[PDB]
Amino acid sequence: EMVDNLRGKSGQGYYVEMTVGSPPQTLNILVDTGSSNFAVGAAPHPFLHRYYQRQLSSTYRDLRKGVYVPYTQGKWEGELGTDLVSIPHGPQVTVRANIAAITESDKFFIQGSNWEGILGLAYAEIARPDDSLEPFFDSLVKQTHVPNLFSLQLCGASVGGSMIIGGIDHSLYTGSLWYTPIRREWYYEVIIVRVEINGQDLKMDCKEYNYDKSIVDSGTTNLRLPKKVFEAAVKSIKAASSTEKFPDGFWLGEQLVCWQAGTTPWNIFPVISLYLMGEVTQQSFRITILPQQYLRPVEDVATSQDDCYKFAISQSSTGTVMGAVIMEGFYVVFDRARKRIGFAVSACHVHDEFRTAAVEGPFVTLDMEDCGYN
Numbered sequence: 001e002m003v004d005n006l007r008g009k010s011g012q013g014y015y016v017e018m019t020v021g022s023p024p025q026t027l028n029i030l031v032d033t034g035s036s037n038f039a040v041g042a043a044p045h046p047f048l049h050r051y052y053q054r055q056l057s058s059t060y061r062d063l064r065k066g067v068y069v070p071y072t073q074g075k076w077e078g079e080l081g082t083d084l085v086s087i088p089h090g091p092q093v094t095v096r097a098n099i100a101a102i103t104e105s106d107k108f109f110i111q112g113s114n115w116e117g118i119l120g121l122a123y124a125e126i127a128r129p130d131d132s133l134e135p136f137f138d139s140l141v142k143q144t145h146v147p148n149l150f151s152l153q154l155c156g157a158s159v160g161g162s163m164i165i166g167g168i169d170h171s172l173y174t175g176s177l178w179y180t181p182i183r184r185e186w187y188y189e190v191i192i193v194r195v196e197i198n199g200q201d202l203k204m205d206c207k208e209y210n211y212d213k214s215i216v217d218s219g220t221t222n223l224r225l226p227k228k229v230f231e232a233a234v235k236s237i238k239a240a241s242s243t244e245k246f247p248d249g250f251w252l253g254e255q256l257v258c259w260q261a262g263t264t265p266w267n268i269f270p271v272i273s274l275y276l277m278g279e280v281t282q283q284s285f286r287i288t289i290l291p292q293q294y295l296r297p298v299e300d301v302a303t304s305q306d307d308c309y310k311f312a313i314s315q316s317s318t319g320t321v322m323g324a325v326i327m328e329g330f331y332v333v334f335d336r337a338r339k340r341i342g343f344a345v346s347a348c349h350v351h352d353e354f355r356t357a358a359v360e361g362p363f364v365t366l367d368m369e370d371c372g373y374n
């Protein structure tokens, strides 16, 4: 019943159907492993087709406290309250949860996205205004018998996939699940120990990859990399693809790259391997990313004699973000109960006739260095 319960549009997040209030008001809610506030449009906005109407809910309780959340992209402010929340195509559970009723926003809501709010699935430590505001998943686990785990299978304008709450769906992946420790419970923080491009080690001190943290973030589109890592990665991708030359603006995400329909030269773009810390000392596994992931298609009927793409790798000053383009085609298990994140090749994994996304291990290094930045 939970399979294929996610929809989206490319670059605009994946959402699940939810209800808030009693009687239930149906809203589409963006699934975000990169924050911890459950928030819903609660006043008219140019890009909202619908919004939460507190006055129509018998079960609403105002908490008499405002809240402000600035993301990497977008920001909102609203009023805290609590109400009943359900997931019609999730576990047949309903919980009373904290809800931020958004009454003002700036570059948050997206024209044509089909979602009206956001479900922050990370830990209390990064909830606003502070960690006493219990996140939704914590409320769900406490109030129901749901096991303390969820999994996301994001598939690659319309996109889809599945969120499985309280379990692992074996029909959604092949091969082995490989686990990386959640380093600290705030974001879903993990450790990258090695990066390869086109099979060639980037050859940096591994702490650089995690300056100042690395996170798994379904709510962010791109692979985001620390400046020094971004610059080295762009250099390596440019070199591997040097049979064709693209404008500087493409590499900065300012510009599209386009080819005649059906002729995208995938083979000239390299594979990227991120090695994630294993559960055992100096052991790791790698997830391999194809250009079908990091060249994000941009749908536009005006450009449709062509296939056009945005470079979905960008610079960060706040550490690494493994966003949606990285997660797509993997089955990603957020095993909160065992403080670990599992990766496997998903049922909707990306591949062509030459190459495929992969999750492979184990790998061993003799280097005794801790790759964590702090």
Ligand SMILES: CCNc1cc(C(=O)N[C@@H](Cc2ccccc2)[C@H](O)CNCc2cccc(C(F)(F)F)c2)cc(N2CCCCS2(=O)=O)c1
Pocket (backbone or CB within 6 Å): 011, 012, 013, 030, 032, 034, 035, 036, 069, 070, 071, 072, 073, 074, 107, 108, 109, 118, 126, 127, 217, 219, 220, 221, 222, 223, 224, 314, 323
């Ligand atoms: C899905 C919408 N496209 C993008 C969304 C976000 C982003 O900030 N996502 C946050 C949720 C969100 C979803 C939809 C619209 C707007 C925001 C996600 O929560 C960020 N997670 C890290 C974070 C950063 C700062 C504060 C917090 C806090 F914890 F919530 F406070 C979390 C970033 C982003 N990037 C920056 C542009 C250039 C492209 S990008 O991918 O590099 C593209």
Ligand SMILES: CCNc1cc(C(=O)N[C@@H](Cc2ccccc2)[C@H](O)CNCc2cccc(C(F)(F)F)c2)cc(N2CCCCS2(=O)=O)c1
Pocket (backbone or CB within 6 Å): 022, 059, 084, 093, 094, 095, 096, 142, 143, 144
């Ligand atoms: C904090 C829980 N609010 C509420 C919980 C339930 C309830 O009975 N939940 C059961 C599932 C359900 C889903 C949708 C409609 C009706 C029922 C659930 O199976 C009960 N689980 C045991 C339980 C009961 C009470 C408290 C708790 C708790 F875990 F301690 F919180 C658990 C109903 C409810 N209301 C529905 C609108 C109209 C009035 S209401 O108060 O009855 C508020």
